[PDB]
Amino acid sequence: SMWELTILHTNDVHSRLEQTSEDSSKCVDASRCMGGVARLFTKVQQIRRAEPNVLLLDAGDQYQGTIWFTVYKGAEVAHFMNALRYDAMALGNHEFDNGVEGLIEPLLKEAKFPILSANIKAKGPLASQISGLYLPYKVLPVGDEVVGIVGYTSKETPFLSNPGTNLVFEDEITALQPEVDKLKTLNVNKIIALGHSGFEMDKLIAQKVRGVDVVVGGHSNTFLYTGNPPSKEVPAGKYPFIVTSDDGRKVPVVQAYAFGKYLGYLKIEFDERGNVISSHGNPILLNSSIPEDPSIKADINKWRIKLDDYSTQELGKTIVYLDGSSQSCRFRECNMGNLICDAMINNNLRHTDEMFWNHVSMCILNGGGIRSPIDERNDGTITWENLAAVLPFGGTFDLVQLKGSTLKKAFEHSVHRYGQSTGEFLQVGGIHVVYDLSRKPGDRVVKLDVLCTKCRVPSYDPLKMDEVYKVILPNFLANGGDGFQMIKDELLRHDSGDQDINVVSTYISKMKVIYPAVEGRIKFSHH
Amino acid sequence: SMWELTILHTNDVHSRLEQTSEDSSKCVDASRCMGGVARLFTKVQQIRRAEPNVLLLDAGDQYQGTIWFTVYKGAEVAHFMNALRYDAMALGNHEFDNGVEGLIEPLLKEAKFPILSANIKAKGPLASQISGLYLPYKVLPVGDEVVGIVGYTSKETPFLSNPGTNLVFEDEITALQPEVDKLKTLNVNKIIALGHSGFEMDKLIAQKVRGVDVVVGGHSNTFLYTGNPPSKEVPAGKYPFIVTSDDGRKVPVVQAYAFGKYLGYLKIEFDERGNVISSHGNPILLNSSIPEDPSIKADINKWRIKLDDYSTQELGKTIVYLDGSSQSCRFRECNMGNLICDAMINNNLRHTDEMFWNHVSMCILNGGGIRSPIDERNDGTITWENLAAVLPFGGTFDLVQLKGSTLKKAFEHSVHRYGQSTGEFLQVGGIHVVYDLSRKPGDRVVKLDVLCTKCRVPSYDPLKMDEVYKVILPNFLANGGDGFQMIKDELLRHDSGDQDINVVSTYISKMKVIYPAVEGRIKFSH
């Protein structure tokens, strides 16, 4: 016979428990808001009532994003994922942001669904302490059939989070294969690979892991769609994306963007042996047509009260849209990058006591460190809550002494694989850079002018490779993050500075009204 | 017979009563300071004791420049020019800044030397009131000889100051020639033209006014030197500058820069008929080698106490040199222009209740309205006094609505006669302009991008001729000044804003530490 399975899936929700603006930022105009767990429940329940065979799965990065996680630390994730009745979750990189303890105690011990990762192996005293709290797979009953779900997590988690020294993140394909093999031997013939490594790993898993029928992914915030997409996000492929495997099968690969804006919806048709005959669907845009569930909403409002202490005090006003979108700040000059770098520079010049850094005028900032926009409509108020979503990583803005050559290398690294929405793209201050993307990686920086320090009047002069420059940047960059190894290995001095979010709030309070522009600090040429 | 005269001269002192930094701003490091009336007195007296026949002349613009003029309103000029025992003064355009009563009551009634201009004609009730308080000439005895001094004043004075409608500024040459001829018939064979119209007009006068022996000038802040100059000022020619006149004579033309930094010094050798045989000299740099005279210095300090109210409160700090120099802000982007425009823009966004201008992001500012730098050395303090010398005109920063086409025409006017250190050169905010000076005047702007207002994220888009733009600018520019007639004629709305010096102090008090850069707002291409 035929056997139909509906996979409903979310990924990279990133602490967006409440409904959001179109662009993921705080909801202001309720009529045009989107996502949030209350709306998501309504739609999930609409599908479950109409189709007998449904799994609702999460591909990780529920942790970290808003003051929801700052205050509740994963308890909100356990609680509201339980209310939605998720069948399964793959662990993501952000599930390690409060260490292993911060994963165990709030989420793994409270979740009423299996949490999965087959490539994470525990070692030392931790092995027995966490044994079973997450599994390599789970076999779930769905009607009269069983469906195997096998988990995986990005092996870049040690560089993006705090998983500690007692977890080993194995290569995904190598770890998955014996588990999918195990399940086949246990006559589990339908197998879903659920995990958090990116669209490109997902296609490889689909290609290389024999026995996997569907791949449900995350980490790259990938939007896939078939036909005319319903919002501002531009499709990266069809939904589902069809990989032709190494063993002659057609493996559908799915993802559902980010921030709870869409519920993925894939209908698979299986044969009696568990081969995929076909599949179809699309992500469902969770727009204001779908009501928020009253019960979930009311429960969100109860949890909300403790968060309102982060939104009482207006820090200041923006009269412009502060564009902290992934699609701006990882691809080109973005005015939120500018605001942050100027804030960094401005705040550092107050510390007059420390005379070495008292004329620092140059700044660099990883695009991937800017995590949300802030909207200017409705008086463009800026609260702590709004800032916390732009800067959730609790970092510092540190001061480094760098060679011109080191800095030149950083600017090449910034665009070395340009076009894949990766976070190493640098927003700046006191620096005018020009990239020519038709040139080879490592040779795309064609102009690099920085504010002089030796001069009485600051002006943008060409960077010289044997000169030394003083620069304010996140400690993440200072310690070699986003693969900026040259910064870490080659810097001449590194000083701790102030906490990132205090720096920017301090700027906003001082300025009262802000209005950062896209000024031409980062340009692209063709010559 | 040979008769030697030494002409000592100043022009465009611009209220620099006290000694100053090299760049004309407030003195801070006294070891390196220059100018001031106390130092000038020491050098004048050194020359008077060596040279028997001496005239000390001023070619105008003593008025306006520092808190000396704000507070004492010209009384300081009369007083200290009297103590230096000036022989005569020509009226300059800034001598009319507080109107005719501001000229009459402090300077003309207290000056113990003749004050001169031959091309200013009084008409109506003023004529009898001002009769004899200024003269077209004076005949000064100098030993057993006499020297006639004939005055002139820029006929741009009506566009640059407040002379009123009862004074008529005649063409210089047409006014001077009858006076010089009159003096000849009066047996005055030695004649000095002392006046305030510019080096170019000075040269014309030399060329065309028969009977003039020397021209002593001002207004253009011109530096002449014969040899290796002593400081940053680049000579525009020899001192004296020799004009070969239409009647076959050599006529030396002299100016001495500005800000009391130099005392002009020219020894003329005349024959028995008052024809110049030879002249030689140079401006003397009034640096700290020359001591300040103890008495004039002590008297300055007595007058100084009323001014210390303007320097007691630090407003903030600059960690960069704030380049308000003529030579930067009239020729290229200068960081003081940028400071002032950013203050203009910033301060205006405070006014939240007025919704029409609350996104204004575009500023234009005449370079000539920026009047002094501010130094960053010794913790770069900024006081009202420092600011008062950057912006001594008392204007407002106003809001206009302009067609792109009007603004495009403004930026063409900005560089139409570029290279002559004129004040119409525009400093800017929210504007990226690029000029090609090889192109024809009226066609030199090859790129003009301005911040969008309709957009949600501000970015620099190319200006559109038929779109409309909201711009903050000096009221001087809104009202047509500096030749920007298109602004006055073509603006669609014009609203009064806040007082200029207030705007910039408020911004500095808010910022605490400022660091304006030259960013590429104004660029030159080939």
Ligand SMILES: CN(c1nc(Cl)nc2c1nnn2[C@@H]1O[C@H](COP(=O)(O)CP(=O)(O)O)[C@@H](O)[C@H]1O)[C@H]1C=Cc2ccccc21
């Ligand atoms: C402080 N940390 C960080 N600090 C900043 Cl300042 N920036 C970061 C950070 N870690 N990642 N990033 C930036 O985000 C990009 C990836 O985003 P996505 O491509 O969207 C996939 P994701 O959704 O899993 O984060 C990267 O390239 C970066 O540009 C990390 C590093 C250690 C750690 C320990 C505990 C907690 C957080 C952290």
Ligand SMILES: CN(c1nc(Cl)nc2c1nnn2[C@@H]1O[C@H](COP(=O)(O)CP(=O)(O)O)[C@@H](O)[C@H]1O)[C@H]1C=Cc2ccccc21
């Ligand atoms: C407010 N007013 C002004 N406001 C600004 Cl905001 N700027 C000005 C002004 N008048 N002139 N300028 C600028 O100065 C330039 C010449 O300098 P110089 O070439 O150095 C020869 P000077 O030394 O005689 O002034 C020009 O081009 C301009 O760029 C003038 C206009 C009427 C009036 C009445 C009473 C008092 C002052 C004023």
Ligand SMILES: *[C@@H]1O[C@H](CO)[C@@H](O)[C@H](O)[C@H]1NC(C)=O
């Ligand atoms: C939600 O999306 C559908 C199509 O995807 C559209 O027809 C509907 O108008 C949308 N609702 C809004 C904008 O509230």
Ligand SMILES: *[C@@H]1O[C@H](CO)[C@@H](O)[C@H](O)[C@H]1NC(C)=O
């Ligand atoms: C004053 O000027 C002369 C050159 O004109 C120079 O020899 C002397 O040392 C100067 N004094 C200074 C800079 O103190």
Ligand SMILES: [Ca+2]
């Ligand atoms: Ca199968």
Ligand SMILES: [Ca+2]
């Ligand atoms: Ca003669």
Ligand SMILES: [Zn+2]
């Ligand atoms: Zn994520």
Ligand SMILES: [Zn+2]
């Ligand atoms: Zn992730």
Ligand SMILES: [Zn+2]
């Ligand atoms: Zn002058």
Ligand SMILES: [Zn+2]
């Ligand atoms: Zn003048």
